[PDB]
Design a protein around this ligand. Structure first.
Ligand SMILES: Cc1cc2nc3c(=O)[nH]c(=O)nc-3n(C[C@H](O)[C@H](O)[C@H](O)COP(=O)(O)O)c2cc1C
Ligand SMILES: Cc1cc2nc3c(=O)[nH]c(=O)nc-3n(C[C@H](O)[C@H](O)[C@H](O)COP(=O)(O)O)c2cc1C
Ligand SMILES: CN(C)c1ccc(/N=N/c2ccccc2C(=O)O)cc1
Ligand SMILES: CN(C)c1ccc(/N=N/c2ccccc2C(=O)O)cc1
Lengths: 206, 192
């Protein structure tokens, strides 16, 4: 299984979501030395937001008629989508920032949801029926939160617009086998982190 | 009232959410001739994402000791927060991008939720009071609103409610254009 690891925390050595994901990646590497791991940084590195030029190009009615300028507008996106297509397992590490994800990860999503590439649609009696184009891929979301109760059955579950939103977006392009490993209370914390780590080691084994 | 208008669409003239929000602002200006409007562009212009440097400064345990470099990391944030403090009514226009908001608006939120400034902790508590918000959003599809078929997929304006609520803005109205009803709804709102 070829892996694409997308890291979304701006923090490096101190990122818990990054560290936990790397725990999973190393463990996996251990069991599968031939396996390819690609890393895509969207936290410590800026990722362009969708511009009007991007929209005009990505939804151009006749795509092969895009100008060289237009293609250039889509070049990063093409690269980012290519990484996804080349992967069987997508691993996203992300903090919860203000009840969602860091803006860099939102930008990454916005680049890789592409008409005619990762999703499609068809016009049925006026309204669009959409169709995902990604097949045979899985996703693991490793997330870290400062507070508690954002998981299932949690007191604050309805406030969680981070990993549940990621599920929705990923599912839209065809990735609906998604596992979320969460550590809470990074400010019981060493416990939550230790549990996430054991969970990730088990997931890596299999 | 003093109004802060935050525009999140990357599109200019073609932006339906921008257009609708400006219909409201012009109408509101007519019912209140000495109103002041401040516009903050977060769609057509890049907003820096939160960096590790931002985190270290913003959550500094002794903020009065911040170095000049740290204050520089928070300079834009202070400006954005100031615009919010100086406003009575916040108007946010935004598209739904992949079941959330454009990344620029996420970045705006990440700049203006600030420890000791728009929220504090002892239990977190909001520090913004006396403000209202109007969210003008447009979507390509249908059924993302209340009682809607796809309401559970909507992490755009419902998420905005959560984040705004955290800092104290809990009087929020959403006007959505899916698929001239929105326009008329907004004209009526501007009259009150
Ligand atoms: C800008 C910012 C926003 C945050 N928002 C939340 C939040 O909404 N809910 C929460 O539980 N923790 C929040 N936190 C705390 C982080 O979720 C927590 O520190 C997390 O572990 C950061 O991920 P990282 O360790 O990979 O950098 C926030 C932290 C920052 C810097
Ligand atoms: C990158 C991108 C993502 C979009 N995602 C969604 C979506 O998830 N759901 C939806 O109903 N429409 C979606 N749309 C359609 C837009 O929501 C629609 O065109 C909207 O009116 C854009 O706002 P604006 O006119 O102010 O630019 C998307 C459009 C773009 C360009
Ligand atoms: C358990 N409840 C109700 C919570 C707990 C934590 C929370 N946000 N945390 C944060 C929010 C913004 C910035 C930094 C943090 C941070 O470092 O924690 C929101 C709601
Ligand atoms: C009927 N349901 C649930 C829907 C309707 C529309 C929809 N996404 N639209 C989009 C999604 C991503 C990118 C661009 C569009 C766009 O231009 O519309 C998703 C789900």
């Amino acid at each position: 299984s070829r892996i694409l690891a997308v890291h979304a925390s701006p923090r490096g050595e101190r990122s818990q979501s990054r560290r936990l994901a790397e725990v999973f990646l190393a463990a996996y590497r251990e069991a599968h030395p031939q396996a390819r791991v690609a890393r895509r940084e969207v936290g410590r590195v800026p990722l362009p937001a969708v511009t009007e030029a991007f929209v005009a190009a990505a939804f151009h009615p006749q795509p092969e008629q895009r100008s060289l300028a237009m293609q250039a507008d889509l070049a990063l996106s093409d690269q980012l989508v290519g990484e996804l297509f080349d992967s069987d397992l997508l691993v996203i590490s992300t903090p919860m920032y203000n009840f969602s994800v860091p803006s860099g990860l939102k930008a990454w999503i916005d680049q890789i949801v592409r008409l005619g590439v990762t999703f499609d649609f068809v016009l049925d009696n006026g309204v669009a029926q959409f169709r995902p184009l990604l097949r045979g891929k899985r996703a693991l979301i490793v997330t870290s939160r400062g507070g508690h109760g954002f998981g299932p059955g949690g007191e604050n579950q309805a406030m969680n617009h981070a990993d549940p939103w990621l599920r929705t977006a990923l599912g839209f392009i065809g990735i609906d086998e998604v596992t979320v490993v969460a550590a809470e209370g990074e400010e019981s914390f060493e416990d939550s982190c230790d549990e996430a780590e054991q969970r990730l080691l088990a997931l890596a084994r299999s």
